[PDB]
Design a protein around this ligand. Structure first.
Ligand SMILES: NC(=O)C1=CN([C@@H]2O[C@H](COP(=O)(O)OP(=O)(O)OC[C@H]3O[C@@H](n4cnc5c(N)ncnc54)[C@H](O)[C@@H]3O)[C@@H](O)[C@H]2O)C=CC1
Ligand SMILES: NC(=O)C1=CN([C@@H]2O[C@H](COP(=O)(O)OP(=O)(O)OC[C@H]3O[C@@H](n4cnc5c(N)ncnc54)[C@H](O)[C@@H]3O)[C@@H](O)[C@H]2O)C=CC1
Ligand SMILES: NC(=O)C1=CN([C@@H]2O[C@H](COP(=O)(O)OP(=O)(O)OC[C@H]3O[C@@H](n4cnc5c(N)ncnc54)[C@H](O)[C@@H]3O)[C@@H](O)[C@H]2O)C=CC1
Ligand SMILES: NC(=O)C1=CN([C@@H]2O[C@H](COP(=O)(O)OP(=O)(O)OC[C@H]3O[C@@H](n4cnc5c(N)ncnc54)[C@H](O)[C@@H]3O)[C@@H](O)[C@H]2O)C=CC1
Ligand SMILES: C[C@H](CCC(=O)NCC(=O)O)[C@H]1CC[C@H]2[C@@H]3[C@H](O)C[C@@H]4C[C@H](O)CC[C@]4(C)[C@H]3CC[C@]12C
Ligand SMILES: C[C@H](CCC(=O)NCC(=O)O)[C@H]1CC[C@H]2[C@@H]3[C@H](O)C[C@@H]4C[C@H](O)CC[C@]4(C)[C@H]3CC[C@]12C
Ligand SMILES: C[C@H](CCC(=O)NCC(=O)O)[C@H]1CC[C@H]2[C@@H]3[C@H](O)C[C@@H]4C[C@H](O)CC[C@]4(C)[C@H]3CC[C@]12C
Ligand SMILES: C[C@H](CCC(=O)NCC(=O)O)[C@H]1CC[C@H]2[C@@H]3[C@H](O)C[C@@H]4C[C@H](O)CC[C@]4(C)[C@H]3CC[C@]12C
Lengths: 255, 255, 255, 255
């Protein structure tokens, strides 16, 4: 029997990483707007504060944090800030990441940054949060991975390998955290219409993309926010260790 | 931003196969309860009708039909009836199927049966239903596949390969139909506490199953129903060609 | 330590299906030429006889059979012919199959033929052969599946779903047959330069193909024959339930 | 037609990491015995030198080098030495790696270590070696990955995700390098009877492992060596981006 309250986050406290823009922002708004008290972490503090305002006008409860996911020290801080403002953490939404297209001969420092962004931060923040969740009797961690973790193409060595590590960590973390009654899932988005996408997309690339997408349209952040809501809601209580690909049933690549 | 109406099925018409018991019955109820008019199909008309009464008790619109999915004559009948009672078709939830464990030396008749129940029936009904949806401007086809489509084990030649063919149909069919604005997805459930499982499970197998499930509890029909609602709802508008697995982050196998 | 005799089929008897042309032919020649006595089954008897001649001049041992894989009755016959001519069967190479691109609204008879060709024949011949292999203490079955079993595109519903069932049967048959000390593997070829490929390939399609293939070249039957030799040789004695994709590291599609 | 010369490595130059024992030692021997001049690298120079003597005893060309793959300074040294002794590089068999089972609460230092051993080292050496190969007109890079790259279980966060990143590198790297005519592949072995396994295995775990292996015997170094020879030979010329799994058709896990 359908029950609208099971698709809502009433009384849940969520840390949302890289929430000042794009997919991240929409998840924050969609979550707070579904009953969750949200902490908005972003490196661009201005963006982070704007979202909080947006949420508050909407009748939401939000706090801002100027964290850089790529800093162990700023991570444990964000984690402390969250428990202080919220009181507890129930949902971790690891959205921040990145890296992008890089040539085979890129410097190893470039190769390494994608792992800091996409794997190490995600895993370390999970470590910092899990103990709280366990203490409350359960929680949910969701990471925004990528379809690059499944695709094969040129100039994607760093990005694609890092997101693959991110998606597989998910399948395995689901075991270690399952004992603590924590669920871990990820969403793998396709061509989402974001500034991030705009910086690397050419008018022809877009077209090639659209012609390989059955549902002829480019993704909007809400598509990802809608899926994040479901995966983090009590309606998905027996869903763990999964990666949901939101891509119109197609494939969108640059090369 | 969270919009509750996108998670409901108001004014949609759904045909559901094998909805007399287990998983299908709950999808039927959850859907009718979420605003859809449903056609409860099953090879057991008594069961089909009982589900119909319950839906009506809950205040929903529903019609019962006795259809054996393994007959093309019976599938057309099912499509016709659905149309004459509903006036249109917006959603197909192809749930009936089965086959189960079988020795390698099984008669070809038993091997082929698995395909009749899980592949040919499902493909053909989509052929029947597609044109109706197409004219309404789109629709959603959903199939209840299986973890066996990915697992490997002894005594599963017929069952596992057929479910694997069904899961790959979803991926390709998503292309042919993306043009008619029809989305196609599937759900592969783990051990769901239903009589089909109760028929093959034992206390030892039971324990071994829970022994490998991170979220330590067997699945409930509602879990599948919850996922089916999201997948068939407006909120999953850009999700096509996917097979979502509901297994508590683990695997439940017989061996 | 390398040992050339481990990559040879000296004293092995192999049934090669659809061996009168393309990939099939090359496997026959490459096998007989590596020490195996070969039975050449094909529906085009003339082609089947030509290959036998070719093999004999080369100093090979071969027999022809005019079998249609899509006939239970011709299958048990082929199996009997093989044991009579060869004395025993050690290697089953299920190469015959087919079907090709079909539209969503194809007749169900067309949908069903791909399964006869790609799944049912393969599974039934395996049943007919396994008992011999068991009797000898072991054997190897190899099927030629396809990359369509992994790819998603339009007009591939029947072909792609059937080959997927074929590839997954492999993963599972490896269990049932493993007790009998039988190994089951498959090879999934990409754009192999065959008349079969020529009938559905356009000059532009070819180019698109080549530009998505890292090893810029189209496959030759020998590539598949070389891989079949390894998979069926004693050097691969602990390799079972695998599908080796030979595709220059790329993807080759029509749509 | 079968051509034995295509299965040999005559006049090729191969660098092999961690070749002092186990799997790497056997690849070294098999390769030198198949006609290649090899550079036995290992963090244990005694071991490296012992392998060199054996290869020379068997009549092959080989050189020992003490390299700890987790140091960029040491990898360049390894590439330089290989070139000054061999004159060119035709094959890279990146075998050294490791990490193993680790609790979820492990220090980030241990999590990151897994990446140093399985991902960064391997990617960087390919950067070093690629230009050498490129000039000879092509080459082959092969990595010894793992089944953990696909399995899911408890205590494998660091180990499994890193191997998963390495396996996906192979898939993408195959693209960047397909142009230089370099092929990239990997082998994911099951339980191979080597001391690394002997360090983690127990008689009970032993039994459970064989309990799920169709071809009921633990793997031997030669099995991996046999597959590596084929993959790095002229016979696999159109095989790139693949990860071949040698596991006897089953899975050997610790839990
Ligand atoms: N836009 C697209 O097409 C797709 C994006 N993704 C993934 O989605 C995630 C984010 O996507 P978008 O919203 O498009 O990105 P975006 O770049 O538009 O916005 C991300 C937000 O993250 C913040 N940020 C960046 N680095 C940070 C750091 N080191 N520490 C803390 N905050 C940081 C930025 O200030 C920004 O406000 C990434 O993990 C990306 O890999 C995956 C598939 C598609
Ligand atoms: N419960 C479980 O453990 C799992 C079930 N499944 C799948 O869920 C689907 C439904 O199974 P459950 O609800 O568990 O089983 P169930 O046996 O409890 O219910 C099946 C319903 O379908 C009807 N049905 C059977 N054959 C039919 C036919 N030939 N034509 C029309 N209707 C027919 C039955 O009469 C019954 O009412 C199947 O596709 C099965 O493969 C997949 C994974 C797990
Ligand atoms: N050519 C290509 O690009 C690729 C082919 N494949 C697969 O390889 C297999 C064969 O490929 P090709 O050698 O290119 O085909 P082909 O059509 O060139 O030759 C196949 C041989 O099979 C025979 N044959 C057809 N139906 C038969 C039947 N019903 N019973 C007995 N014999 C029959 C034909 O007479 C012919 O001599 C098929 O399973 C196909 O799905 C997979 C990937 C690529
Ligand atoms: N034997 C098994 O059960 C399996 C092993 N593997 C993989 O096979 C590869 C090799 O392992 P085995 O032969 O089994 O192990 P092993 O422990 O028997 O041999 C490893 C060799 O690599 C050397 N080595 C270790 N660290 C090194 C470093 N930091 N730099 C340079 N050389 C180093 C060791 O001294 C030793 O000589 C690894 O990538 C491992 O992940 C994968 C699956 C199974
Ligand atoms: C270029 C930016 C990253 C910029 C940065 O962080 N530096 C990255 C981040 C998200 C990436 C996208 C994705 O993750 C989704 C998608 C994955 C495909 O394999 C490649 C295209 C495509 C559409 C990616 C293109 C490159 C994007 C847009
Ligand atoms: C025995 C019945 C089929 C009966 C029939 O329709 N004929 C089937 C239908 C669903 C099947 C289950 C699933 O599909 C899910 C699961 C998949 C695993 O690989 C094996 C166990 C397990 C738990 C299956 C055992 C057999 C079940 C319970
Ligand atoms: C059209 C013919 C079948 C004709 C028939 O049997 N009738 C089929 C058989 C083998 C098929 C090919 C393959 O199996 C390999 C490959 C798979 C891709 O997903 C589609 C293209 C591509 C290259 C296929 C094109 C269609 C082919 C050439
Ligand atoms: C313990 C050592 C690593 C030691 C190290 O380098 N540090 C590792 C290296 C290879 C590993 C094995 C594999 O990679 C293969 C296999 C993969 C399964 O998912 C788990 C068990 C199993 C059998 C692994 C157990 C742990 C092993 C034996």
């Amino acid at each position: 029997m359908f029950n609208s309250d099971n698709l809502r986050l009433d009384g849940k406290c969520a840390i949302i990483t890289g929430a000042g823009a794009g997919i991240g922002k929409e998840i924050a708004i969609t979550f707070a707007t579904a009953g969750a008290s949200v902490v908005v972490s972003d490196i661009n503090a201005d963006a982070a504060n704007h979202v909080v305002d947006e949420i508050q006008q909407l009748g939401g409860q939000a706090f801002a944090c100027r964290c850089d996911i790529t800093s162990e020290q700023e991570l444990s801080a964000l984690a402390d800030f969250a428990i202080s403002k919220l009181g507890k953490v129930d949902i971790l939404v690891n959205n921040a990441g990145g890296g992008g297209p890089k040539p085979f001969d890129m410097p190893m420092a470039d190769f390494r940054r994608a792992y800091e962004l996409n794997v190490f931060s995600f895993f370390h923040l999970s470590q910092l949060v899990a103990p709280e969740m366990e203490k409350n009797g359960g929680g949910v961690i969701l990471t925004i991975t990528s379809m690059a973790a499944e695709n094969k193409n040129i100039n994607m060595t760093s990005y694609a390998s890092s997101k693959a590590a991110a998606s597989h960590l998910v399948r395995n973390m689901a075991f270690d955290l399952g004992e603590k009654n924590i669920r871990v899932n990820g969403i793998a988005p396709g061509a989402i219409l974001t500034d991030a996408l705009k910086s690397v997309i050419t008018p022809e690339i877009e077209q090639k993309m659209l012609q390989h997408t059955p549902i002829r349209r480019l993704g909007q952040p809400q598509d990802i926010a809608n899926a994040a809501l479901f995966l983090c809601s009590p309606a998905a209580s027996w869903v763990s260790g999964q990666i949901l690909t939101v891509s119109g049933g197609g494939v969108q690549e640059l090369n």
